Symmetry: D2
Subunit: 115 residues, 4 copies
């Protein structure tokens, strides 16, 4: 699993469950081609988005539907979505975890890139 | 000033100076139209992007060029940019401060919205 | 003003108003001695804690009463308080802004240090 | 495992390895009794601190030696340590993960409390 996403909820102190997201890959014409998508599990995680073979170098965008998450909780959110845009680069075997910690008016995001 | 941005550096504990950013507004045809742009000052702040009359209701995107910031400091960061996308002025005019705290592999972002 | 604190609310997207905090300084006997205290204003800021002459080198602790903040909003938060402990003025006098962004189960804290 | 700690590094985008920490429990005389300690693994995690039987309600402090971590990396840090102080409360079976994301001049911390 070369690319995984983890989402946590800073209001409830829990995994953010059933958070939908779409992953896009930047095309030569600078448009965002849909690449993969899913919803987070009960652990706030989304696995199995891509494979080693297809996860080639390039610019990728993860668009996390945080607005729908907060709306389902009855809490007014600020952002339309949380977007994480990064370049994936071949420097040895790399596994990427994109993590986001969500609050209604704020979010934090980090990457855990390992071998 | 109804739309201001502030950027801090979490490595040096300082304002993030000379950070370029572009603001877009979603058009009726669903494309992102250019709205305003600028760079942060010595205080890490960017003021004067718009006016109360021009800053109508809509969905706005602030694209903060964090990559160029880190690269000029010798650092190859994870993110291509920090994106902040939000609906503004849906309940009447408000003043928005978009803030981002930057590290090479992570950033946090929040908003301060006043009436 | 060499020591200022700013506190924001990540749920409401606003300053965190009326947040009490106590500042301590580590004594030569290694106990925490009271140094200054106050509460945040309508802007979420606390100024006037000390002076350049009084704010000598040393290890300082800012104890931010986040629990009382959340409880007054009806929320039972995770943390008892937010603690920020740092050495100040070790290379000569500096100006410090201690910032905290609060959510019920999470907070971020940073420092802005200027010469 | 009722209490676990996870530490990540926002400069290198990796688990924070070999980070030492001590856990304290508040005593009746308001002093901090040493309770448990350890160093994070290659995954940035510390398990096996306590057991269900001894992890009773009370106020607990996790003191994370972030200063030694950054010093070992040759990077000048702001904080003496990162402290996380919380009340553990019996509301059904609860597992606590205390997580911290570290930068030299800033850190974020959250709790993931589950059943
Ligand atoms: C969404 C995950 C996450 O994102 C963070 C950001 Cl962005 C800032 C600070 C923190 Cl602490 C976190 C954080 C975690 O708490 C976390 C991470 C992993 I990997 C994990 O297995 C568990 I359990 C918890
Ligand atoms: C409490 C202030 C604060 O703390 C943060 C943390 Cl800890 C992480 C990320 C962010 Cl973006 C912030 C943040 C701000 O938004 C901020 C800071 C300053 I100085 C400021 O003048 C204004 I306006 C806004």
């Amino acid at each position: 699993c070369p690319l995984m996403v983890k989402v946590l909820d800073a209001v409830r102190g829990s995994p953010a469950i059933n958070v939908a997201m779409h992953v896009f890959r930047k095309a030569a014409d600078d448009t965002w081609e849909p690449f993969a998508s899913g919803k987070t599990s009960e652990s706030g995680e989304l696995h199995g988005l891509t494979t080693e073979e297809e996860f080639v170098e390039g610019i990728y965008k993860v668009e996390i539907d945080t607005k729908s998450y907060w709306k389902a909780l009855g809490i007014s959110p600020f952002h339309e979505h949380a977007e994480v845009v990064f370049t994936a680069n071949d420097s040895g075997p790399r596994r990427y975890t994109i993590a986001a910690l969500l609050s209604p008016y704020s979010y934090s995001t980090t990457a855990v890139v390992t071998n």
